[PDB]
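request received
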Amino acid sequence: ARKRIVVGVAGGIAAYKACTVVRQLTEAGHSVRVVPTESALRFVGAATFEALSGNPVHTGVFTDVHEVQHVRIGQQADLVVIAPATADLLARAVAGRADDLLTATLLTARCPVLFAPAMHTEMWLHPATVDNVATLRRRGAVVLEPASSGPGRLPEAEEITTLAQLLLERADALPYDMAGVKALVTAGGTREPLDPVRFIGNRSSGKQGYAVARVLAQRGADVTLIAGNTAGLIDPAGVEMVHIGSATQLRDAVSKHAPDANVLVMAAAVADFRPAHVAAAIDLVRNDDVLAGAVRARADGQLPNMRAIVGFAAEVLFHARAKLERKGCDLLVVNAGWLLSADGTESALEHGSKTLMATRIVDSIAAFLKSQ
Amino acid sequence: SARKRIVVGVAGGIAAYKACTVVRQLTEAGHSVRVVPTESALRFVGAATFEALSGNPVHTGVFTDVHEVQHVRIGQQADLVVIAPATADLLARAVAGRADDLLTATLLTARCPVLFAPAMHTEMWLHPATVDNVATLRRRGAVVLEPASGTGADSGPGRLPEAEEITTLAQLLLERADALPYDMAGVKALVTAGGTREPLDPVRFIGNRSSGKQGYAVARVLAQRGADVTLIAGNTAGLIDPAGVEMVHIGSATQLRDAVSKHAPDANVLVMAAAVADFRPAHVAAAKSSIDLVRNDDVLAGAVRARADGQLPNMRAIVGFAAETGDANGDVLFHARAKLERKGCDLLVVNAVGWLLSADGTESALEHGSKTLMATRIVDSIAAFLKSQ
Amino acid sequence: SARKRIVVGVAGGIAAYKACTVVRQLTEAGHSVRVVPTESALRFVGAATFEALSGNPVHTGVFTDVHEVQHVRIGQQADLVVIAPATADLLARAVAGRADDLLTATLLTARCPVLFAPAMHTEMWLHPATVDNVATLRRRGAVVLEPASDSGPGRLPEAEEITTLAQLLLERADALPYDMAGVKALVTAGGTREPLDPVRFIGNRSSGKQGYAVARVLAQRGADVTLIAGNTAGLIDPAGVEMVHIGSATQLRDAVSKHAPDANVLVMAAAVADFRPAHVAAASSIDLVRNDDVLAGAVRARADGQLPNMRAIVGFALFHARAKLERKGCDLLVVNAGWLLSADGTESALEHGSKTLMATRIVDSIAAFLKSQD
Ligand SMILES: Cc1cc2nc3c(=O)[nH]c(=O)nc-3n(C[C@H](O)[C@H](O)[C@H](O)COP(=O)(O)O)c2cc1C
Ligand SMILES: Cc1cc2nc3c(=O)[nH]c(=O)nc-3n(C[C@H](O)[C@H](O)[C@H](O)COP(=O)(O)O)c2cc1C
Ligand SMILES: Cc1cc2nc3c(=O)[nH]c(=O)nc-3n(C[C@H](O)[C@H](O)[C@H](O)COP(=O)(O)O)c2cc1C
Ligand SMILES: Nc1ccn([C@@H]2O[C@H](COP(=O)(O)OP(=O)(O)OP(=O)(O)O)[C@@H](O)[C@H]2O)c(=O)n1
Ligand SMILES: Nc1ccn([C@@H]2O[C@H](COP(=O)(O)OP(=O)(O)OP(=O)(O)O)[C@@H](O)[C@H]2O)c(=O)n1
Ligand SMILES: Nc1ccn([C@@H]2O[C@H](COP(=O)(O)OP(=O)(O)OP(=O)(O)O)[C@@H](O)[C@H]2O)c(=O)n1
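response:
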């Protein structure tokens, strides 16, 4: 259960944010060794990383040579996380440099490698960085899309920790395969009002919707995410946020952005009905099916971009295979998980995290779009 | 003059003390050696060791003795640059084109053959960045030796080849700059080498005086040019296993043919350079004044006939070896072409106890030189033939 | 465990990069090795090198790790201390009883065997201060390897030699007394090659190791050794041993003839072939002839007073064994399939171990026989 993680820290202003990544990985029961660059010590000192990780902090290969630390750290690692990954670090990782303990450890690691780049937009968008990021991606490393006045800010420490424990559970979880895919996602419970202060709502976290949006984003999809009431979820890096209120405001937001979308995933738990009298200081009216309405602009001919629609269902193997054909979605998800597509294929989602399940969902979407 | 100027670059690997004997052997062979270590190499082996072994000063940066314009004169005057060990860091700097210490600045300056001898932990060696860099150095004209694998649990490639292997591959490039193109990639080659031992008893036996140097040389040259080489060796003159070849040790000629028949199906090229014993001893006792002899099987003929009977499909080139002393009944090329059509070989190496003859009709006079230089002429023709077939 | 603890000390000679191969070899043999360099050795080989090979920390003075009592525990837990190279300066400090760095402090506290492998320029080695210091260390119970051979003596012996002798002292502490000073010895080793024609021949699977061992142990105990070698398993010349190679068994007979006069000990350890082929073809069924018993030829000349100086002859290869010695005429006989029979009837069972170990027993028996007539 307790995995061995290396946390590489390169020399960026965001280095103090790695402290939080180390503390959380440690709180989750994991064994963390911090390997900073020399230039990271100009930002956070070895003492801080030594107290948070509980293990010694060294920057070069020529210390504790008797314990062969330049190979053993990488050979025994279950994951390598670099946060922040500077342009310089990425440039060295691509070149295959091994001139400090962090880059030598990268060459030795035969485990998943997660870069969380952080830098100024101009650096991130410079053609050397762009090619370097592409090369690391095609070599099998995960390079998180940074957050956004432009792109380049380090993703929040929770997003990095979550994606780290994801790769610990499933090494192939985040291939850079959904490039060029545009995706509108919905998540969170909607709030149907009856008062400028009071309302009716439900208990959905939004986590699985957010999880699916995050996994799409970190696999290359240009994601747009319309959220309602969430369990205080913070926005995923690189996804465009559109916050909404009512189950009606959800519909308008969908039909505002859905034409540009290539893929749409209804994870929102929209409430069935809706009140009709809103006193400014029990008259319900049943709300429209936003998912089912999408399949119809589908047919009526104004979604010549849409190539996949996925639905979420609440708990029976065969009892649900009817719902996908009836609802007209390209595939449907349900957990008491099981995934069912419109080609008859069905698979049971082995138990896991909302993000781990989100990867199975995003896998089944990629396969569907291949079959076209 | 036969005295060449060698630059020995030493990068920061555990193997740096092995570079010491490399410089000792090259100076003992009359060459003039300048050692250019990286700064990290100095934490493994001291400058004083290299100054005493080479007799020349040892510096790591370009800003020393800039009056003697050493950052260019050191490269401009070298006949060979050898890097041993070449670390993953150093290969990466050479590929990027860095010139930030004296060694890498010498690499941009040198116009002579350039020999890297990598040494690393296997995981560094198989890392995609390392393998891309090795490919780029090779496409750019450098020779990058395939490392050794010397075990049980911590085996795998990445070990520095033995100094003798490095020094004799260094001398090869001093003699022939184009000796080691990476051209045999994708071919599997089976090589026999050495003499055989035909037992009279457990203790005594009949044998010949074969050193094995010929076959080992072609195995080595094949390995260092890309081939996945297997080497069936009998008795040799204490020859170290070449870097990157699978080794199989046999005692007798019967034991050789069983070993050849065991590995020939996976092979693309077979090199019969082993001096195989013509006749055996009739009775093998168990302890100890006229001993009878029985003829052994012609394993080389055994392979061509099995090939013509469809039992060796992926076999594409069978090269035999022949010893020669003078020509009277015809010329040497006349009798060799007859020996080549009769045995069914694709290539015949006639040893002047050089001549290279080919089933395509090619013939070539091998000039005198080192056994390893002759192996490159041989491997050239094995390549030339495979292009034809 | 068979895992013994070895201290390899390294002093500041050009030969320090050769100690790296000693450390690796002792480590491949399963032992735990702690390298203790002098400060001036770090000018030649870095601490980082010795750390990667030894797998153990590398320190140079006594004040590091004072908590885990290293100034003393490094010596009093060692099973062997080998110094390679041992410079003149190190030998002088060891004789003085200096302890001003970790290596010298370790030497004063060790109670196991101590093996010095000196290496230096010949003028340093033959300077009277060094000569005296080498004699004091030998007198005091240390083993000081005679170094190898500009062309003079003082080269570090090969690593394989040092590790061989290191593992020998791990098996027998008293194995290399400096007892055979002045003795002229001549040894034969290896198999022999009787040619049929210029390229073919008939050989035997003799390694030469057992004969090389006896020549090595003799030279490192004080003797001047001439080794006549046949076909060996690619063996390296022992340091301090005039080498003479031979081919056929008559070429050996010819070689023992030239050199046996000057000698005081003959160790007929070669596996000489008894039969030679009928004729050399210079290019069926092979008839053969017989070769001279070299050992029996050797006892005859001694018996006819042709070898005045030779005081001991040893043969090789105890039901009929005691009779074999009396029939051979040899002074001692080594029987392997060990047992060592003497020319005064006393026999001893050489408990089988390393070849070099039983070589020290063979030299033991030679030593007692030479002191018999002294
Ligand atoms: C205050 C400050 C903040 C920096 N932030 C970043 C950054 O966020 N990303 C980046 O690539 N470089 C950043 N740099 C530049 C790096 O310090 C520089 O590239 C350095 O060599 C670190 O690389 P390394 O940690 O991989 O060795 C910053 C520099 C300074 C002075
Ligand atoms: C004990 C030890 C052994 C090492 N061995 C190697 C090696 O064999 N190959 C390698 O590429 N790197 C090795 N390294 C990593 C290098 O020391 C490091 O990459 C160094 O910066 C290489 O730089 P250079 O280009 O100056 O050699 C080793 C490091 C240590 C501590
Ligand atoms: C390149 C060089 C090689 C040397 N080699 C030896 C040597 O092999 N033996 C020796 O006794 N002194 C040698 N010396 C001289 C010194 O005595 C030696 O390096 C050092 O001072 C001895 O100190 P130590 O006790 O640490 O060995 C050498 C000096 C140099 C500069
Ligand atoms: N007002 C609503 C309510 C539900 N949804 C969508 O409908 C699906 C689930 O509704 P349904 O087809 O009725 O199946 P259930 O799981 O039973 O519905 P519920 O959410 O109430 O559990 C989800 O994909 C959700 O996006 C919708 O379109 N608009
Ligand atoms: N029993 C044997 C003996 C020889 N060979 C192969 O055949 C070649 C030489 O056979 P041979 O006809 O005896 O060669 P010659 O032309 O007579 O020259 P020489 O024997 O002196 O080498 C060598 O390549 C050897 O590898 C073989 O396969 N089987
Ligand atoms: N031609 C020979 C053969 C034997 N020896 C010596 O004799 C010893 C071996 O004894 P040996 O009598 O040859 O052993 P056996 O196998 O019994 O041989 P033999 O028929 O002679 O008894 C060795 O020291 C060896 O060097 C010798 O001097 N010359």
